[PDB]
Amino acid sequence: GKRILLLEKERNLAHFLSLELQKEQYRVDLVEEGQKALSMALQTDYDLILLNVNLGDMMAQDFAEKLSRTKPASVIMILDHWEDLQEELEVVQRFAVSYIYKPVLIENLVARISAIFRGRDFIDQHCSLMKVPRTYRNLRIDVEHHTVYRGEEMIALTRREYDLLATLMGSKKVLTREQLLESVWKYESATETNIVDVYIRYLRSKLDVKGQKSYIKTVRGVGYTMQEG
Amino acid sequence: GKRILLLEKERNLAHFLSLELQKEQYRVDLVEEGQKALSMALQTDYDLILLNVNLGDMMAQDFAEKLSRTKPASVIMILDHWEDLQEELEVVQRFAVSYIYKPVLIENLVARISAIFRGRDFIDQHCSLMKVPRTYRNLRIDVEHHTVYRGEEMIALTRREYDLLATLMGSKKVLTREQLLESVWKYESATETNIVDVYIRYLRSKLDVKGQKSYIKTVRGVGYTMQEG
Protein backbone atom coordinates (compact mmCIF):
# COMPACT_ATOMS: atom_id res chain seq x y z
CA GLY A 1 0.00 0.00 0.00
CA LYS A 2 1.56 3.27 -1.22
CA ARG A 3 1.62 6.01 1.44
CA ILE A 4 0.51 9.57 0.58
CA LEU A 5 0.85 12.72 2.68
CA LEU A 6 -1.98 15.11 1.77
CA LEU A 7 -2.07 18.81 2.69
CA GLU A 8 -4.88 20.44 0.70
CA LYS A 9 -6.27 23.77 1.94
CA GLU A 10 -9.77 23.20 0.45
CA ARG A 11 -11.21 20.85 3.03
CA ASN A 12 -14.12 19.67 0.86
CA LEU A 13 -11.71 18.58 -1.90
CA ALA A 14 -9.28 17.09 0.65
CA HIS A 15 -12.02 14.93 2.06
CA PHE A 16 -13.16 13.53 -1.25
CA LEU A 17 -9.66 13.16 -2.66
CA SER A 18 -8.65 11.17 0.39
CA LEU A 19 -11.64 8.86 -0.05
CA GLU A 20 -10.92 8.12 -3.71
CA LEU A 21 -7.22 7.53 -3.04
CA GLN A 22 -8.12 5.06 -0.29
CA LYS A 23 -10.46 3.35 -2.75
CA GLU A 24 -7.35 2.69 -4.84
CA GLN A 25 -5.91 1.07 -1.67
CA TYR A 26 -3.42 3.85 -0.99
CA ARG A 27 -2.84 4.91 2.60
CA VAL A 28 -3.64 8.62 3.11
CA ASP A 29 -2.37 10.73 5.97
CA LEU A 30 -4.41 13.93 5.89
CA VAL A 31 -2.69 16.94 7.48
CA GLU A 32 -3.36 20.66 7.78
CA GLU A 33 -0.22 22.46 9.00
CA GLY A 34 2.92 22.85 6.94
CA GLN A 35 5.19 22.33 9.92
CA LYS A 36 3.37 19.17 10.92
CA ALA A 37 3.50 17.86 7.35
CA LEU A 38 7.24 18.50 7.39
CA SER A 39 7.72 16.67 10.69
CA MET A 40 5.68 13.79 9.32
CA ALA A 41 7.68 13.59 6.09
CA LEU A 42 10.94 13.65 8.04
CA GLN A 43 9.99 10.65 10.17
CA THR A 44 8.01 8.66 7.59
CA ASP A 45 8.91 7.78 4.03
CA TYR A 46 5.93 8.74 1.89
CA ASP A 47 5.64 7.59 -1.68
CA LEU A 48 3.96 10.90 -2.54
CA ILE A 49 3.46 14.27 -0.82
CA LEU A 50 0.64 16.32 -2.29
CA LEU A 51 0.73 20.04 -1.50
CA ASN A 52 -0.46 23.45 -2.61
CA VAL A 53 2.00 26.19 -3.57
CA ASN A 54 1.52 27.84 -0.16
CA LEU A 55 1.11 25.51 2.81
CA GLY A 56 -0.03 28.30 5.16
CA ASP A 57 2.83 28.58 7.60
CA MET A 58 5.46 28.11 4.86
CA MET A 59 5.82 27.85 1.08
CA ALA A 60 6.00 24.45 -0.59
CA GLN A 61 9.41 25.52 -1.86
CA ASP A 62 10.66 25.86 1.78
CA PHE A 63 9.04 22.60 2.77
CA ALA A 64 10.86 20.91 -0.12
CA GLU A 65 14.28 22.46 0.57
CA LYS A 66 14.15 21.55 4.26
CA LEU A 67 13.00 18.01 3.59
CA SER A 68 15.61 17.65 0.84
CA ARG A 69 18.40 18.04 3.40
CA THR A 70 17.86 14.43 4.40
CA LYS A 71 15.49 13.03 1.72
CA PRO A 72 16.56 14.82 -1.44
CA ALA A 73 14.61 12.60 -3.86
CA SER A 74 11.26 13.14 -2.07
CA VAL A 75 8.27 12.78 -4.36
CA ILE A 76 6.26 16.02 -4.16
CA MET A 77 3.32 16.96 -6.35
CA ILE A 78 1.76 20.43 -6.39
CA LEU A 79 -1.98 20.98 -6.84
CA ASP A 80 -3.12 24.57 -7.20
CA HIS A 81 -5.12 27.15 -9.11
CA TRP A 82 -3.65 28.71 -12.27
CA GLU A 83 -2.48 32.01 -10.84
CA ASP A 84 -0.87 30.51 -7.75
CA LEU A 85 1.09 27.93 -9.71
CA GLN A 86 1.96 30.26 -12.59
CA GLU A 87 3.57 32.78 -10.23
CA GLU A 88 5.85 30.04 -8.86
CA LEU A 89 6.10 27.80 -11.88
CA GLU A 90 9.86 27.91 -12.35
CA VAL A 91 10.57 26.88 -8.76
CA VAL A 92 7.79 24.27 -8.67
CA GLN A 93 9.32 22.70 -11.76
CA ARG A 94 12.58 22.40 -9.82
CA PHE A 95 11.36 20.69 -6.64
CA ALA A 96 8.13 18.94 -7.75
CA VAL A 97 7.81 15.67 -9.62
CA SER A 98 4.59 16.98 -11.18
CA TYR A 99 1.98 19.71 -10.91
CA ILE A 100 -1.71 19.84 -11.76
CA TYR A 101 -4.19 22.71 -11.91
CA LYS A 102 -7.32 23.23 -9.88
CA PRO A 103 -10.19 23.07 -10.62
CA VAL A 104 -9.58 19.36 -10.92
CA LEU A 105 -11.63 16.24 -11.36
CA ILE A 106 -10.59 13.84 -8.63
CA GLU A 107 -10.44 10.93 -11.07
CA ASN A 108 -7.89 12.72 -13.27
CA LEU A 109 -5.87 13.47 -10.16
CA VAL A 110 -5.94 9.88 -8.94
CA ALA A 111 -4.97 8.77 -12.42
CA ARG A 112 -1.96 11.11 -12.51
CA ILE A 113 -0.82 9.86 -9.08
CA SER A 114 -1.04 6.29 -10.29
CA ALA A 115 1.13 7.13 -13.31
CA ILE A 116 3.80 8.77 -11.12
CA PHE A 117 3.80 5.68 -8.86
CA ARG A 118 4.14 3.30 -11.83
CA GLY A 119 6.95 5.44 -13.27
CA ARG A 120 8.83 5.47 -9.98
CA ASP A 121 8.41 1.72 -9.60
CA PHE A 122 9.74 1.20 -13.12
CA ILE A 123 12.88 3.23 -12.43
CA ASP A 124 13.32 1.24 -9.19
CA GLN A 125 13.65 -2.06 -11.07
CA HIS A 126 16.86 -0.82 -12.79
CA CYS A 127 15.58 -2.00 -16.15
CA SER A 128 17.95 -0.88 -18.87
CA LEU A 129 15.95 -1.48 -22.03
CA MET A 130 17.90 -3.49 -24.58
CA LYS A 131 17.06 -4.51 -28.14
CA VAL A 132 15.49 -7.98 -28.33
CA PRO A 133 16.62 -10.59 -30.88
CA ARG A 134 13.68 -12.10 -32.72
CA THR A 135 15.42 -14.72 -34.91
CA TYR A 136 18.06 -17.38 -34.47
CA ARG A 137 18.79 -19.75 -37.36
CA ASN A 138 15.31 -20.86 -38.46
CA LEU A 139 13.74 -19.93 -35.09
CA ARG A 140 11.27 -17.05 -35.08
CA ILE A 141 10.39 -15.38 -31.76
CA ASP A 142 6.95 -13.73 -31.46
CA VAL A 143 7.60 -11.53 -28.46
CA GLU A 144 4.02 -10.25 -27.98
CA HIS A 145 2.54 -13.74 -27.82
CA HIS A 146 5.49 -15.46 -26.11
CA THR A 147 5.56 -18.00 -28.90
CA VAL A 148 8.38 -19.54 -30.87
CA TYR A 149 8.34 -21.05 -34.36
CA ARG A 150 10.90 -23.39 -35.97
CA GLY A 151 10.36 -22.53 -39.58
CA GLU A 152 6.54 -22.53 -39.72
CA GLU A 153 5.98 -25.03 -36.84
CA MET A 154 4.99 -23.52 -33.49
CA ILE A 155 7.22 -24.98 -30.75
CA ALA A 156 5.22 -25.15 -27.49
CA LEU A 157 7.82 -23.81 -25.10
CA THR A 158 6.60 -23.38 -21.54
CA ARG A 159 7.10 -20.04 -19.84
CA ARG A 160 10.31 -21.08 -18.10
CA GLU A 161 11.65 -22.55 -21.36
CA TYR A 162 10.68 -19.42 -23.30
CA ASP A 163 12.42 -17.30 -20.65
CA LEU A 164 15.58 -19.40 -20.78
CA LEU A 165 15.74 -19.22 -24.57
CA ALA A 166 15.31 -15.46 -24.53
CA THR A 167 18.00 -15.00 -21.90
CA LEU A 168 20.46 -17.06 -23.98
CA MET A 169 19.53 -15.30 -27.24
CA GLY A 170 19.81 -11.95 -25.45
CA SER A 171 23.49 -12.34 -24.51
CA LYS A 172 26.37 -12.59 -26.96
CA LYS A 173 28.63 -13.83 -24.14
CA VAL A 174 28.26 -17.32 -22.73
CA LEU A 175 26.20 -17.37 -19.52
CA THR A 176 27.09 -19.22 -16.33
CA ARG A 177 24.54 -21.46 -14.63
CA GLU A 178 24.59 -18.87 -11.85
CA GLN A 179 23.79 -15.98 -14.22
CA LEU A 180 20.98 -18.07 -15.70
CA LEU A 181 19.63 -18.71 -12.22
CA GLU A 182 19.69 -14.99 -11.51
CA SER A 183 17.91 -14.33 -14.82
CA VAL A 184 15.25 -16.97 -15.43
CA TRP A 185 14.63 -17.40 -11.68
CA LYS A 186 15.27 -13.77 -10.75
CA TYR A 187 13.67 -12.71 -7.47
CA GLU A 188 12.94 -16.33 -6.42
CA SER A 189 15.95 -16.94 -4.18
CA ALA A 190 16.99 -19.99 -6.19
CA THR A 191 20.04 -21.88 -4.92
CA GLU A 192 20.65 -25.10 -6.87
CA THR A 193 22.09 -24.39 -10.31
CA ASN A 194 21.16 -27.99 -11.16
CA ILE A 195 17.69 -26.81 -12.22
CA VAL A 196 19.29 -24.83 -15.06
CA ASP A 197 20.49 -28.11 -16.60
CA VAL A 198 17.02 -29.62 -16.25
CA TYR A 199 15.50 -26.79 -18.31
CA ILE A 200 18.30 -26.67 -20.91
CA ARG A 201 17.38 -30.31 -21.49
CA TYR A 202 13.69 -29.50 -21.66
CA LEU A 203 14.52 -26.74 -24.13
CA ARG A 204 16.74 -28.89 -26.38
CA SER A 205 14.10 -31.61 -26.49
CA LYS A 206 11.52 -29.14 -27.81
CA LEU A 207 13.75 -27.27 -30.27
CA ASP A 208 16.55 -29.53 -31.47
CA VAL A 209 16.13 -31.65 -34.62
CA LYS A 210 17.87 -34.97 -35.31
CA GLY A 211 20.70 -34.70 -37.77
CA GLN A 212 21.01 -31.00 -36.94
CA LYS A 213 23.25 -29.19 -34.52
CA SER A 214 21.51 -28.38 -31.26
CA TYR A 215 20.21 -24.86 -30.93
CA ILE A 216 21.90 -24.68 -27.49
CA LYS A 217 25.64 -24.86 -26.88
CA THR A 218 27.09 -26.43 -23.73
CA VAL A 219 30.43 -24.78 -22.97
CA ARG A 220 31.65 -27.63 -20.72
CA GLY A 221 33.81 -25.12 -18.87
CA VAL A 222 31.45 -22.38 -17.86
CA GLY A 223 27.81 -22.56 -18.91
CA TYR A 224 25.56 -22.22 -21.93
CA THR A 225 25.00 -20.15 -25.05
CA MET A 226 23.20 -20.43 -28.39
CA GLN A 227 24.68 -22.85 -30.96
CA GLU A 228 25.47 -21.36 -34.39
CA GLY A 229 24.29 -23.75 -37.08
CA GLY B 1 -3.26 -4.91 -12.20
CA LYS B 2 -2.09 -8.53 -12.40
CA ARG B 3 -4.84 -11.05 -13.07
CA ILE B 4 -4.97 -14.52 -11.45
CA LEU B 5 -7.12 -17.56 -12.27
CA LEU B 6 -7.61 -19.52 -9.05
CA LEU B 7 -8.97 -23.08 -8.86
CA GLU B 8 -8.31 -24.44 -5.38
CA LYS B 9 -10.37 -27.42 -4.24
CA GLU B 10 -10.20 -26.48 -0.52
CA ARG B 11 -12.82 -23.71 -0.33
CA ASN B 12 -11.69 -22.39 3.04
CA LEU B 13 -8.14 -21.82 1.76
CA ALA B 14 -9.41 -20.58 -1.57
CA HIS B 15 -11.41 -17.90 0.22
CA PHE B 16 -8.57 -16.55 2.32
CA LEU B 17 -6.02 -16.93 -0.48
CA SER B 18 -8.25 -14.83 -2.73
CA LEU B 19 -8.52 -12.07 -0.13
CA GLU B 20 -4.80 -11.87 0.52
CA LEU B 21 -4.03 -11.74 -3.20
CA GLN B 22 -6.57 -8.96 -3.62
CA LYS B 23 -4.78 -6.98 -0.90
CA GLU B 24 -1.77 -6.81 -3.23
CA GLN B 25 -4.15 -5.31 -5.80
CA TYR B 26 -4.16 -8.50 -7.86
CA ARG B 27 -7.45 -9.36 -9.59
CA VAL B 28 -8.55 -12.87 -8.61
CA ASP B 29 -11.07 -14.87 -10.65
CA LEU B 30 -12.16 -17.76 -8.41
CA VAL B 31 -13.39 -20.89 -10.28
CA GLU B 32 -14.44 -24.37 -9.22
CA GLU B 33 -14.55 -26.35 -12.48
CA GLY B 34 -11.62 -27.40 -14.64
CA GLN B 35 -13.59 -27.03 -17.86
CA LYS B 36 -14.70 -23.53 -16.89
CA ALA B 37 -11.14 -22.68 -15.81
CA LEU B 38 -9.91 -23.70 -19.25
CA SER B 39 -12.54 -21.73 -21.14
CA MET B 40 -11.60 -18.67 -19.10
CA ALA B 41 -7.87 -19.16 -19.75
CA LEU B 42 -8.42 -19.33 -23.50
CA GLN B 43 -10.56 -16.18 -23.61
CA THR B 44 -8.40 -13.99 -21.33
CA ASP B 45 -4.63 -13.72 -20.71
CA TYR B 46 -3.99 -14.41 -17.02
CA ASP B 47 -0.63 -13.57 -15.48
CA LEU B 48 -0.85 -16.65 -13.27
CA ILE B 49 -3.11 -19.69 -13.14
CA LEU B 50 -3.10 -21.48 -9.80
CA LEU B 51 -4.25 -25.09 -9.79
CA ASN B 52 -4.13 -28.33 -7.88
CA VAL B 53 -2.71 -31.45 -9.55
CA ASN B 54 -6.25 -32.77 -10.17
CA LEU B 55 -8.83 -30.19 -11.17
CA GLY B 56 -11.82 -32.48 -10.66
CA ASP B 57 -13.08 -32.99 -14.20
CA MET B 58 -9.50 -33.30 -15.56
CA MET B 59 -5.85 -33.32 -14.57
CA ALA B 60 -3.88 -30.08 -14.53
CA GLN B 61 -1.60 -31.80 -17.04
CA ASP B 62 -4.53 -32.03 -19.48
CA PHE B 63 -5.48 -28.43 -18.74
CA ALA B 64 -1.94 -27.30 -19.58
CA GLU B 65 -1.69 -29.40 -22.73
CA LYS B 66 -4.96 -28.04 -24.11
CA LEU B 67 -4.11 -24.45 -23.17
CA SER B 68 -0.62 -24.77 -24.64
CA ARG B 69 -2.10 -25.15 -28.14
CA THR B 70 -3.03 -21.48 -28.13
CA LYS B 71 -0.94 -20.13 -25.24
CA PRO B 72 2.19 -22.30 -24.86
CA ALA B 73 3.98 -20.02 -22.39
CA SER B 74 1.02 -19.84 -19.96
CA VAL B 75 2.05 -19.24 -16.34
CA ILE B 76 0.75 -22.13 -14.27
CA MET B 77 1.58 -22.80 -10.65
CA ILE B 78 0.59 -26.00 -8.83
CA LEU B 79 -0.42 -26.05 -5.16
CA ASP B 80 -0.98 -29.42 -3.59
CA HIS B 81 -0.22 -31.83 -0.79
CA TRP B 82 3.02 -33.88 -0.83
CA GLU B 83 1.52 -37.17 -2.03
CA ASP B 84 -0.55 -35.60 -4.79
CA LEU B 85 2.37 -33.60 -6.20
CA GLN B 86 5.04 -36.26 -5.66
CA GLU B 87 2.95 -38.72 -7.68
CA GLU B 88 2.93 -36.32 -10.64
CA LEU B 89 6.17 -34.44 -10.01
CA GLU B 90 8.06 -35.04 -13.27
CA VAL B 91 5.04 -34.01 -15.36
CA VAL B 92 4.33 -30.99 -13.16
CA GLN B 93 7.97 -29.86 -13.42
CA ARG B 94 7.56 -29.70 -17.20
CA PHE B 95 4.33 -27.68 -17.47
CA ALA B 96 4.33 -25.58 -14.26
CA VAL B 97 6.33 -22.43 -13.65
CA SER B 98 6.52 -23.44 -9.99
CA TYR B 99 4.99 -25.75 -7.43
CA ILE B 100 4.38 -25.41 -3.70
CA TYR B 101 3.25 -27.88 -1.05
CA LYS B 102 0.21 -27.75 1.14
CA PRO B 103 -0.09 -27.20 4.04
CA VAL B 104 0.81 -23.71 3.05
CA LEU B 105 0.98 -20.35 4.73
CA ILE B 106 -0.91 -17.81 2.63
CA GLU B 107 1.74 -15.13 3.17
CA ASN B 108 4.40 -17.48 1.70
CA LEU B 109 2.30 -18.26 -1.36
CA VAL B 110 1.62 -14.58 -2.04
CA ALA B 111 5.32 -13.81 -1.76
CA ARG B 112 6.18 -16.58 -4.25
CA ILE B 113 3.50 -15.43 -6.72
CA SER B 114 4.79 -11.88 -6.48
CA ALA B 115 8.36 -13.01 -7.15
CA ILE B 116 7.24 -15.00 -10.20
CA PHE B 117 5.41 -11.91 -11.48
CA ARG B 118 8.43 -9.64 -11.12
CA GLY B 119 10.58 -12.27 -12.82
CA ARG B 120 8.23 -12.43 -15.80
CA ASP B 121 8.20 -8.63 -16.02
CA PHE B 122 12.00 -8.43 -16.08
CA ILE B 123 12.10 -10.74 -19.07
CA ASP B 124 9.05 -9.17 -20.69
CA GLN B 125 10.45 -5.62 -20.47
CA HIS B 126 13.76 -6.84 -22.05
CA CYS B 127 15.84 -5.49 -19.18
CA SER B 128 19.59 -5.81 -19.58
CA LEU B 129 21.24 -8.46 -17.43
CA MET B 130 23.84 -6.09 -16.10
CA LYS B 131 24.12 -4.99 -12.48
CA VAL B 132 22.66 -1.59 -11.66
CA PRO B 133 25.48 1.02 -11.90
CA ARG B 134 26.45 2.52 -8.56
CA THR B 135 29.45 4.67 -9.48
CA TYR B 136 30.48 7.02 -12.25
CA ARG B 137 33.71 9.00 -12.08
CA ASN B 138 33.70 10.32 -8.50
CA LEU B 139 29.89 9.91 -8.21
CA ARG B 140 28.46 7.39 -5.80
CA ILE B 141 24.85 6.21 -6.12
CA ASP B 142 23.02 4.92 -3.04
CA VAL B 143 20.23 3.11 -4.86
CA GLU B 144 18.26 2.17 -1.74
CA HIS B 145 17.95 5.76 -0.53
CA HIS B 146 17.85 7.37 -4.02
CA THR B 147 20.78 9.57 -3.00
CA VAL B 148 23.93 10.60 -4.83
CA TYR B 149 27.35 11.63 -3.50
CA ARG B 150 30.12 13.56 -5.31
CA GLY B 151 33.12 12.63 -3.27
CA GLU B 152 31.84 12.86 0.32
CA GLU B 153 29.23 15.55 -0.49
CA MET B 154 25.59 14.61 -0.87
CA ILE B 155 24.09 16.25 -3.96
CA ALA B 156 20.39 17.00 -3.47
CA LEU B 157 19.07 15.59 -6.73
CA THR B 158 15.29 15.63 -7.00
CA ARG B 159 13.47 12.43 -7.80
CA ARG B 160 13.18 13.44 -11.43
CA GLU B 161 16.87 14.41 -11.60
CA TYR B 162 17.81 11.13 -9.91
CA ASP B 163 15.68 9.08 -12.30
CA LEU B 164 17.26 10.87 -15.25
CA LEU B 165 20.80 10.30 -13.97
CA ALA B 166 20.02 6.62 -13.41
CA THR B 167 18.64 6.18 -16.90
CA LEU B 168 21.72 7.83 -18.46
CA MET B 169 24.06 5.71 -16.28
CA GLY B 170 21.99 2.63 -17.09
CA SER B 171 22.85 2.68 -20.81
CA LYS B 172 26.22 2.48 -22.56
CA LYS B 173 24.53 3.91 -25.66
CA VAL B 174 23.39 7.44 -26.36
CA LEU B 175 19.74 7.95 -25.43
CA THR B 176 17.47 10.13 -27.50
CA ARG B 177 15.13 12.61 -25.85
CA GLU B 178 12.30 10.36 -27.02
CA GLN B 179 13.94 7.44 -25.21
CA LEU B 180 14.48 9.55 -22.09
CA LEU B 181 10.85 10.61 -22.20
CA GLU B 182 9.74 7.01 -22.49
CA SER B 183 11.72 5.91 -19.41
CA VAL B 184 11.91 8.85 -17.00
CA TRP B 185 8.33 9.93 -17.82
CA LYS B 186 7.02 6.46 -18.62
CA TYR B 187 3.25 6.22 -18.12
CA GLU B 188 2.90 10.03 -17.89
CA SER B 189 2.02 10.36 -21.58
CA ALA B 190 4.48 13.25 -21.93
CA THR B 191 4.98 14.38 -25.50
CA GLU B 192 7.14 17.52 -25.22
CA THR B 193 10.74 16.48 -25.79
CA ASN B 194 11.67 19.93 -24.48
CA ILE B 195 11.25 18.88 -20.85
CA VAL B 196 14.20 16.45 -21.15
CA ASP B 197 16.51 19.34 -22.01
CA VAL B 198 15.19 21.26 -19.05
CA TYR B 199 16.04 18.52 -16.53
CA ILE B 200 19.43 17.83 -18.15
CA ARG B 201 20.27 21.44 -17.35
CA TYR B 202 18.93 20.96 -13.79
CA LEU B 203 21.11 17.84 -13.42
CA ARG B 204 24.24 19.62 -14.67
CA SER B 205 23.75 22.57 -12.34
CA LYS B 206 23.69 20.21 -9.35
CA LEU B 207 26.51 17.87 -10.33
CA ASP B 208 28.96 19.88 -12.40
CA VAL B 209 32.02 21.54 -10.91
CA LYS B 210 34.00 24.51 -12.20
CA GLY B 211 37.07 23.49 -14.13
CA GLN B 212 35.81 19.93 -14.65
CA LYS B 213 34.19 18.30 -17.63
CA SER B 214 30.41 18.03 -17.19
CA TYR B 215 29.10 14.69 -15.98
CA ILE B 216 26.55 14.80 -18.82
CA LYS B 217 27.47 14.69 -22.51
CA THR B 218 25.36 16.41 -25.13
CA VAL B 219 25.55 14.50 -28.40
CA ARG B 220 24.56 17.13 -30.97
CA GLY B 221 21.51 15.97 -32.89
CA VAL B 222 21.14 12.59 -31.19
CA GLY B 223 20.54 12.88 -27.45
CA TYR B 224 22.45 12.55 -24.22
CA THR B 225 24.79 10.19 -22.43
CA MET B 226 27.30 10.21 -19.57
CA GLN B 227 30.57 12.15 -19.98
CA GLU B 228 33.88 10.36 -19.34
CA GLY B 229 36.17 12.51 -17.24
Author numbering:
A (entry chain B), B (entry chain A): 2 to 230
Task: Give the article text.
Here we describe the two-component-like orphan response regulator RitR (Repressor of iron transport Regulator) as the archetype of a novel family of peroxide-sensing transcription factors in the pneumococcus and related species. RitR contains an Aspartate-less Receiver (ALR) REC-like domain, which retains the common (α/β) fold of canonical REC versions, yet lacks “invariant” residues in its catalytic pocket required for typical phosphotransfer, including the phospho-accepting Asp residue crucial for the histidine kinase-response regulator phosphorelay.. Here we show that RitR regulates pneumococcal iron homeostasis in response to cellular peroxide concentrations through its single Cys (Cys128) located within the linker domain of the protein. Atomic structures of RitR in its oxidized and reduced states demonstrate a dramatic mechanism of activation that hinges on the helical unraveling and subsequent formation of an inter-protomer disulfide bridge to enable DNA binding and transcriptional regulation of Piu.
To observe structural rearrangements after RitR oxidation at the atomic level, we purified, crystallized and solved the atomic structure of native wild-type RitR in the peroxide-induced oxidized, free dimeric form. Because the individual protomers of RitROX were sufficiently close to the RitRC128S structure, the dimeric RitROX structure could be largely solved using molecular replacement (structural statistics can be found in Table 1). At least in the absence of its DNA target sequence, the oxidized RitR structure revealed that its individual domains do not change significantly upon oxidation with H2O2. However, the relationship between protomers changes dramatically, whereupon oxidation, as predicted, the DNA-binding domain is released from the α4-β5-α5 interface of the REC domain. In the absence of its interacting DNA, the final result of the free form of oxidized RitR produces an unusual domain-swapped structure, i.e. where the DNA binding domain from protomer 1 binds to the RD of protomer 2 and vice versa. Importantly, the RitROX swapped domain structure is possible due to the effective unwinding of the C-terminus of the linker (α5 helix) to free Cys128, enabling it to form the inter-protomer disulfide bridge, and unequivocally showing that Cys128 is responsible for dimer formation. Aside from the Cys128-Cys128' linkage and the adjacent Ser129 forming a main chain nitrogen bond to the hydroxyl side chain of Ser129' in the other protomer, there are few observable electrostatic interactions between swapped dimers to hold the conformer together. However, a comparison of average B-factors between the RitRC128S and RitROX structures revealed that although REC-DBD interactions appear almost identical in their 3-dimensional atomic coordinates, there are major differences in their average residue B-factor values, where the RitRC128S and RitROX structures exhibit average alpha carbon B-factors of 11.03 and 36.25, respectively.
